[PDB]
Design a protein around this ligand. Structure first.
Ligand SMILES: Nc1ncnc2c1ncn2[C@@H]1O[C@H](COP(=O)(O)OP(=O)(O)OC[C@@H]2C[C@@H](O)CN2)[C@@H](O)[C@H]1O
Ligand SMILES: [Cl-]
Ligand SMILES: [Mg+2]
Ligand SMILES: [Mg+2]
Length: 361
């Protein structure tokens, strides 16, 4: 109602529901173990009993809305110069809404360094500690804005530059690429088993952009292999490297096995905390879950890692594909910023549903 638009609304609202559920007002951090989280989940009456009335969204939704609101304000056929001004401004400004929302170090530090308005004032230098998932968690709606094939170059550039406004490390900003790219694939009903291959094919194009852009190319290139290698390895493991083949999951892949797997994906032991593994876990959830919100939630919202970020990503992708089908109303009806999220979604659809261009840098 319209069917196109319904998917956009769900992408935005269920991304935020995911964040809130995966955050639980920071309480999951005192457990930091999927089995312990799943048992506390049971004692709250399970997923369908959860009322998000008092479950605040975290930094993930706040920053996702900032992306979305910037895209919307940029309008039809924007100067990429204006879009980057607006993304910087929205990111910097949204830092005022992080009370009790546990934002990340790179997100905060860098958003506060930006100089929106000044030519190139939204660029920061390369940094070794900037491979967190703070760019990936907020980039999905770039794929809603720019879903058409003709726009791939835009999606690549915008996802990367939105990302490296806070995360100028390929592990960071390629997270944003994957987040946006897969949202675009979901918009276009591209079956999820093809998404990984798609990303592996676009990484050389992302590299060509980073190279022509001319910023810290030496450093960017030298760290480039970590992301790529982790994704190759993961798609190999799941048997979807060829992108024609349905995924293979282990016989034994319950809550406990998922935690250990998420830890093996991680940079330094914390599943989904980085730009490579946050979208990877969301992707793994989406591939297992099909049309089940409960399944997606048990895999992407409730685990011992950065479940808020994995949930934000997975909930967006999943909502694009499946709308609100099978979702308990208590899980989103009183979700913080629901009206705001619906309104931005509608506005993103207006733009996204029209195959326009950008005025280049
Ligand atoms: N170069 C790196 N490669 C892989 N991971 C890295 C790299 N540099 C930093 N990280 C990891 O990224 C994790 C999160 O980074 P931060 O800068 O603290 O957080 P940020 O990415 O801004 O936000 C992450 C959000 C914050 C919460 O919503 C949970 N997820 C850190 O604990 C690091 O372990
Ligand atoms: Cl449950
Ligand atoms: Mg968060
Ligand atoms: Mg205040």
């Amino acid at each position: 109602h319209h069917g196109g638009m319904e998917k956009y609304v769900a992408a935005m609202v269920l991304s935020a529901a995911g964040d809130a559920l995966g955050y639980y007002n920071g309480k999951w951090e005192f457990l930091q173990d999927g089995e312990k989280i799943h048992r506390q989940l049971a004692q709250l009456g399970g997923l369908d009993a959860l009322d998000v009335g008092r479950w605040r969204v975290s930094d993930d939704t706040v920053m996702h809305l900032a992306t979305a609101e910037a895209l919307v304000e940029a309008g039809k056929a924007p100067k990429l110069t204006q879009l980057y001004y607006l993304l910087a401004k929205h990111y910097q400004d949204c830092m005022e809404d992080m009370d009790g929302r546990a934002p990340g170090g790179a997100s905060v530090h860098n958003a506060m360094q930006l100089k929106p308005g000044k030519p190139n004032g939204w660029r920061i230098p390369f940094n070794s500690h900037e491979g967190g998932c703070g760019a990936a968690m907020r980039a999905m709606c770039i794929g809603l804005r720019f879903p058409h094939h003709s726009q791939l170059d835009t999606l690549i550039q915008v996802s990367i530059e939105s990302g490296r406004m806070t995360h100028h490390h390929p592990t960071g900003y390629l997270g944003a690429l994957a987040s946006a790219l897969f949202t675009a694939y979901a918009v276009n009903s591209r079956p999820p088993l093809q998404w990984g291959k798609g990303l592996m094919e676009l990484l050389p194009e992302a590299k060509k952009y980073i190279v022509q852009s001319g910023y810290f190319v030496e450093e960017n290139l030298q760290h480039w292999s970590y992301f790529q290698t982790k994704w190759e390895n993961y798609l190999k493991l799941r048997g979807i490297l060829d992108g024609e083949s349905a995924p293979t999951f282990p016989e034994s892949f319950g809550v406990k096995e998922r935690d250990q797997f998420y830890t093996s994906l991680s940079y330094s032991g914390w599943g989904g905390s980085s730009g490579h593994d946050a979208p990877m876990i969301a992707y793994d959830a989406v591939l297992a879950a099909g049309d089940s919100w409960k399944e997606l939630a048990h895999r992407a919202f409730f685990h011992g890692g950065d479940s808020d970020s994995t949930a934000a990503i997975a909930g967006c992708w999943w909502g694009v594909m499946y709308g609100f089908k099978g979702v308990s109303p208590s899980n989103y009806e009183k979700l913080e910023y629901r009206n705001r999220l619906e309104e931005t979604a509608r506005a993103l659809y207006s733009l996204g549903s029209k195959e326009d261009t950008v005025i280049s840098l």
